[PDB]
Structure formats: structure tokens, C-alpha cells
Amino acid sequence: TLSILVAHDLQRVIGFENQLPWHLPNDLKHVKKLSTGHTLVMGRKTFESIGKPLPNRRNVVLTSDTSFNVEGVDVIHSIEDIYQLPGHVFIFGGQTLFEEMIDKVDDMYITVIEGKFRGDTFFPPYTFEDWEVASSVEGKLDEKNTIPHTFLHLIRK
Ligand SMILES: NC(=O)C1=CN([C@@H]2O[C@H](COP(=O)(O)OP(=O)(O)OC[C@H]3O[C@@H](n4cnc5c(N)ncnc54)[C@H](OP(=O)(O)O)[C@@H]3O)[C@@H](O)[C@H]2O)C=CC1
Ligand SMILES: CCc1nc(N)nc(N)c1C#C[C@@H](C)c1cc(OC)cc(-c2ccncc2)c1
């Protein structure tokens, strides 16, 4: 299985100055649940914005930099290398990788942040005409999660 995993706002904003424009604990819990034991694939900027691999899953970074070798990180150099990864593989970001992979994924796990943030990086446009709603779950609000959000699992038609 090849899946996208993304949090985007109402305008499909995903990033601002190599950070997430929002803090949402629930969505981190969502990601843990979903990806632990599996593989995450990310572009070099996405990785470098955190600088440390996520524990308890396979962290793969795509880059043209042939001297990239962070401990706990496996490296790939082409889009093609993705199809050679065994298991459930999550396209994890960022914008440029999402743009390359959106027409190739089986399904998408989208967290919709029901807000409008300033951004410089965006999830590619998509229409529901192409995607079946497998599930739509409204996120729960509290003191730690103050921003409305919806977990969408979308499967290609
Ligand atoms: N909200 C969310 O769910 C997510 C948001 N983000 C955000 O996205 C932003 C980063 O996005 P973006 O700027 O597009 O960068 P990316 O994370 O997509 O990384 C881009 C880099 O990945 C490498 N790469 C991509 N495609 C290829 C290829 N086909 N062959 C070889 N290398 C390739 C290149 O690295 P190199 O230059 O070294 O060759 C390229 O410069 C950040 O702001 C981050 O916060 C990221 C993930 C999720
Ligand atoms: C969760 C935010 C998020 N939510 C959703 N629904 N999809 C995503 N693809 C991302 C994402 C992402 C990128 C920016 C990322 C890469 C990374 O490299 C492994 C570590 C983290 C991270 C680890 C723990 N705490 C904060 C951030 C985030």
C-alpha cells in the first residue's frame, strides 16, 4: 500500500517557513497511530525541518544529495525507489513530494485543519470526483486542541 499522509488547512496550506503553521497534539497522535511499524517517505526539506527521525518506523528521505547519511534514516535518490519499499508506505511530505505522488497513491489520510493560516507551501488541488470518502471523523476539541479538524480517509476511485 502507498498512502499520502498530510495535514492541510482550508486553502490546502501545509507549511510556513519550514514549520507547521499550527500545533495540534491530536494530529501527532493520529500520525503515531497510523505510521508506527510502517514506512514514512519525505523530501529533504521536510526532514531537515525536524532534524531527527521519528522513532518506531522506517524513516526514508528522498534527496539528490549523495553524501546524505543521518543515523536512523535510510536514503533514496529517485521517485522510482519508492515502489521498491516493502510494506505500508506513507508519503509524508512535503509539497514537492506530494505533487509528485498524488497521482500514484492508492489512498490519502488527510487531516483538514478547519482554519486559514498564512502559508508558503501547499497541498496539491484535488477533487472528490476522483476520491471516495472512506471515513470522515471530526476531531475532538479541548484545552490542548483548540483548532477544529477533520480526519479524512480518501481512497482513489
Ligand atoms: N502539514 C503537513 O502535513 C506537511 C507539511 N510539510 C511542510 O512542507 C514544507 C516543505 O516542502 P517542500 O519545500 O516542497 O520540500 P520537500 O519536503 O518536498 O523536499 C524537497 C526536496 O526533496 C528532494 N526531492 C524531491 N523530489 C525529488 C526527486 N524526484 N529526486 C530527488 N530528490 C527529490 C529534493 O531534495 P534535494 O534538494 O536535497 O535534492 C527537494 O529539494 C515544509 O514547510 C514542511 O513544514 C511537510 C510534510 C507534511
Ligand atoms: C504531525 C504533522 C503531520 N500531520 C499529518 N496529518 N500529516 C503529516 N504528514 C504531518 C507531518 C509532517 C512533517 C513536518 C514532520 C516530519 C518529521 O520527520 C520525521 C517529524 C515531524 C514531527 C514529529 C513529532 N513532533 C512534531 C513534528 C513532522
Author numbering: 1 to 157
The study reports:
Dihydrofolate reductase (DHFR) is a critical enzyme in the recycling of folate cofactors that are essential for the synthesis of deoxythymidine monophosphate and several amino acids. Using high resolution structural information, we have developed a new class of antifolates characterized by a unique propargylic linker that shows activity against an expanded set of enzymes from important pathogens.
Interestingly, the structure-activity relationships observed in the biphenyl series did not directly translate to those analogs containing heterocyclic systems at ring C. Whereas the propargyl methyl and B-ring methoxy groups significantly impacted the activity of the biphenyl series, these substituents showed little effect in S. aureus DHFR across the heterocyclic series (compounds 24–28, 31, 36, 37). In order to understand the divergence between activity in the biphenyl and heterocyclic series, crystal structures of S. aureus DHFR bound to compounds 7 or 25 were determined. Comparison of the structures of S. aureus DHFR:NADPH:25 and S. aureus DHFR:NADPH:1 reveals a dramatic reorientation of the hydrophobic regions of the pyridyl series relative to the parent biphenyl analogs. In fact, a different enantiomer of pyridine 25 preferentially crystallizes relative to the enantiomer observed with 1. This new configuration forces a change in conformation for the nicotinamide ring of NADPH in order to maintain π-π stacking as well as a change in the conformation of Ile 50 that interacts with the proximal aryl ring. The stabilizing solvation of the pyridyl nitrogen at the opening of the active site drives the reorientation of compound 25 relative to compound 1. In order to evaluate whether the compounds are bactericidal or bacteriostatic, we measured the minimum inhibitory and bactericidal concentrations (MBC) of compounds 24, 25 and TMP in strain Staphylococcus aureus subsp. aureus ATCC 44300. From these results, the MIC values match the MBC values for compounds 24 and 25, with both values equal to 0.078 µg/mL.
